[PDB]
Amino acid sequence: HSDLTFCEIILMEMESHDAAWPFLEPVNPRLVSGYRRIIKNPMDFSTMRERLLRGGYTSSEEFAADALLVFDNCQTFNEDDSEVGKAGHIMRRFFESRWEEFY
Ligand SMILES: Cc1ncccc1N[C@H](C)CS(C)(=O)=O
């Protein structure tokens, strides 16, 4: 149980983070030229939240893979000095730090 209890804590903390604004909703491929072609597996916090709320995470490791996918996608599509990239680096360091705090 407490495995998925912490996932809720960490997800809510990412959701409310100052740097979370790029990752709150799915990227809109109609607005982001090239996104569909380059990113094979989109992921974002609201999709993780939908999946966490109706039970679809078997372990904490499934949840972490989705979190890391958000930031791997961010680094694949966005330059490191771009505004989305800088936000994603903050969010990625936040997630890894908070996740290791725990396990
Ligand atoms: C996470 C990400 N990655 C690549 C470009 C943009 C983004 N974030 C945007 C906020 C998504 S939007 C609303 O479609 O423009």
Side-chain angles (χ1 to χ4, degrees):
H1 179 58
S2 268
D3 262 18
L4 259 63
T5 288
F6 184 80
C7 293
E8 169 67 47
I9 294 181
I10 201 167
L11 181 52
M12 166 251 287
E13 286 183 345
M14 290 189 284
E15 287 174 322
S16 57
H17 197 292
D18 289 352
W21 59 270
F23 314 107
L24 295 176
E25 290 302 317
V27 173
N28 189 342
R30 295 170 176 176
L31 302 170
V32 185
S33 163
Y35 200 76
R36 204 199 283 281
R37 160 180 55 82
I38 287 174
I39 292 308
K40 302 304 180 79
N41 298 120
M43 188 44 61
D44 71 282
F45 297 155
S46 74
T47 302
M48 294 166 61
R49 158 74 58 209
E50 289 181 9
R51 177 156 172 210
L52 185 59
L53 276 186
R54 69 160 289 180
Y57 282 118
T58 305
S59 59
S60 70
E61 275 98 17
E62 289 197 2
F63 172 90
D66 266 355
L68 298 172
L69 182 59
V70 179
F71 312 124
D72 285 336
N73 289 339
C74 179
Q75 290 171 95
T76 296
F77 191 82
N78 307 275
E79 311 264 28
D80 297 311
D81 55 3
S82 85
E83 294 306 301
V84 167
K86 290 191 283 191
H89 282 307
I90 293 170
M91 287 310 298
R92 179 187 50 78
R93 279 183 306 256
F94 176 82
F95 168 81
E96 282 176 14
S97 167
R98 200 64 159 75
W99 186 263
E100 282 157 20
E101 190 131 2
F102 188 59
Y103 303 110

